[PDB]
Every structure is written in C-alpha cells, then in structure tokens.
Amino acid sequence: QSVLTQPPSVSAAPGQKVTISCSGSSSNIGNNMVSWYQQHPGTAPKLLIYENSKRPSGIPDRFSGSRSGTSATLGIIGLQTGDEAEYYCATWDGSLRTVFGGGTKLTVLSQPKAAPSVTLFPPSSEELQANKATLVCLISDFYPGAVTVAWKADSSPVRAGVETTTPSKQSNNKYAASSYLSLTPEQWKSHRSYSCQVTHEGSTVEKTVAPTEC
C-alpha cells in the first residue's frame, strides 16, 4: 500500500459519469492541495487538475476534482474513448516529498465484463535438469484489462522473486498477462504445493500446482 490510495481499476460506459478517489491523511491531503494526472501508455503524464479543483486551460470541464477532508476525488463526466488511461493523484506529504497514489486504470466499457482465465505450468523437467526452476502463471481473456496477482507457498504469502507483466491486448480485444515465480529445485520440492492468486474487478480465481503429479 501507498501513502495515497486509489482503486486499481474503474470502468464506465461511453457517456457515463465516473469518479476516482484518492485517499490519504492529515500527513498529506489534510494539509496540501492535490493534483491530478492522465497518463496514456507510452506518453508522459499530463496535468488534469491542480489546487484540489483548478483546471489548467486546455482541459475540458467534465474533468473536475475536489478535496474533502483527507480525501480527494477526480470526476469525469460524459465519457469518451480517449479518456481510457491511467490516472494519478499527488501532493506533498509530511514525510518530505511529493507522493503519488498507486494509479487507477480507467477502462471505458467497449465490450462486456470478461472474467480472467488462469493457467499455471509447473517448472519443466528440462529446466530442472539444468538445476533451475520457474513457475509460469498465465491469465487470459479478461476485460477490463486489470489484474492483481498474488503467490502463496502451501499457503505462505511469498512476495519475493515475482515478476508480473502489465496486461496486454489480445487479438480478440481482451487482456492477457503473465507472472513468473523463480526458485531453486530445493524450494519447489520443499513444499507440498504452490498457488497463483488473481483478483479481477474484485473477484479471485486460482490454480494450484504441486511437485507430485507422476
């Protein structure tokens, strides 16, 4: 978790109201003015709002922000297609820096809601035969394109060795993604099972592979 909190993902239908919320504390928002950024991938971040609610000229009303208490909210009215991007909030924090929220992916609902399709390959023998291991977790056919991955050992939350790609668009206009858990054959054997844990739009499916299959 970050100093500022945003929802990883938010969606609406072309033309609908949406709202993104930045959440903080006395240490920051209670005391400095937030600003808002649109980022389209491959381009730099672009200032949408500043001073809680002011708008640099060139920015459409329909983009509005505001602060209340130690929270702030960006509001996007009359949704469009070019509105699909990642949005950040930011302010000074008492810790002595500018700080950003984790970044909300705003998806403008082109097709309907596709739940992800998870597959987990266990470390291949030919890898093990060269004394290495890697577990490959592939996620499929999801929309909005936004997933959170977690990994557990027997049921131990492991954070270390993880590598997840950002969601990529598929031929079918749906999203794919892949995580990779690196290890040593000691580890892969030192446990009765490993799990892959995908939360999407608020719903978690998982697949669980073990050393023993054969």
Add this chain to the structure above:
Amino acid sequence: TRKGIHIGPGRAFYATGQITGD
C-alpha cells in the same frame, strides 16, 4: 500551520532571504 503562498503552475517566484539569515 500559518501558512501560505501558493505558487500556481507556470508562475515564477523569487525568495532568497531568509529574513533570519544564513
């Protein structure tokens, strides 16, 4: 608390000081 002077975007500002010295 007290407080203040917002430098807005693209507005220049000049201080040195610092009225209590360096």
Add this chain to the structure above:
Amino acid sequence: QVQLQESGPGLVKPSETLSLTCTVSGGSISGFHWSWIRQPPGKGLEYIGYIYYSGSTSYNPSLKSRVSMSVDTSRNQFSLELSSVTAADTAVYYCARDFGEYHYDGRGFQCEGFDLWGQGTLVTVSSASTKGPSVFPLAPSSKSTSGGTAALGCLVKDYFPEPVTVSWNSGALTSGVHTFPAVLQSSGLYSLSSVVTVPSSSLGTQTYICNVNHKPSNTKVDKKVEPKSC
C-alpha cells in the same frame, strides 16, 4: 511553448552512477523549481526531488543518500545523479517543472506540482553481457478439459539485450498466439513467454515448434513442445 528534454545514457552497469540532464527551451530556468520523477515500467510514479533555479535542493528522503541534482543557468540545463545503482533503478526517467506551496517558515517549497514534463528516457541498469536465452517447454495443460481447449507455450529466459522474436510452427500458426512482453529480472536478464491456445484434440498431434531468435547473439532455437508425460 516551453519544452523540456531528457538526455543521458540508456544503459548503466550496477554500482556505477546514473546521470541525466534535462534541457529546457522556450523559457528560462529562472524562477522555477525543477524535478526528476522516475517510473519503473508497469509501475507507478516516484518523485526523486527538486532543485530551485538558484541551486537549493530537496531530495526524497528515501533516495537522499544516493541522489544529487545541479542546475546550470547558462546552458539552461539541470541534471540528476543516481549513485550505486541497482536493478531497482531501471525506469523511465522524466524531468519536470514544479508548483506548490511556499513557506517563509523554513519549510520553503512544498512540491504538489509538475505541470510540465519531458517525454522521459528509459534507463536500464545491467551488468548482463549479451547472453543468448535458454528455451524451455511450457508443459501443455495435461489432464482435465473444461471449456474444451488446452494451452501451451515456450519460456525464453535469461537473455540480453532484447528483443527476441518468437515464431510458431516455423510460421504456420499465427492465431490464438500471444507473445507476452519481455520482463526484466533482478539479474540484468530478460524473460518472456509465447503461448498458443489449441484444441484438446488430442494431442498429439500436431506439433508445434518455437522459433526463438536472439538476433544480437545469433541464437536461433527451435523447440519441440510434447504433452504431459504424467
């Protein structure tokens, strides 16, 4: 109007110093505070610090011990120095003009800001020295078929520099084929994966090879991906 531009190396060996210069035009450095903000790919944004035109600075407390900025009024340029870099410093680096609250208190400039950004420059931290990849089979689904189809792929691992091209069946199968993006590991070494969704009939057959090319290290590799064995 006023435009900023990042410049500097694109690849840097761990433990060395990272250096970058932001070059400003259409306006003066004068009267503004200026910043570097980096972004590890697929991650979000982290502010590194700011420098005031007259030279005063303020560095994000987490990096302070490693970071250094300087301003050159004449050249209309400012610059960053990241020291003892590691895997974690691999990022797009942006430079920016700031705004925010000023205090005569002694707390000076509170940066809330950034209204102006360069395009950013990617900097890759790595010791890796042009290894070709090792290609491994992604055990085809095996045992159990709901929905009705199966999936397999290749695992291309530990290589530098990118890219790599993954073909399939020498070129015969390009449908339901996803090449995932090249991830970069704390080693200095890349990895990605290709995957094709196929009929649960049976297999075999058919079959079903990967055409991995590490063109920088002239390593073409075909790989036979044959089912379960369970």
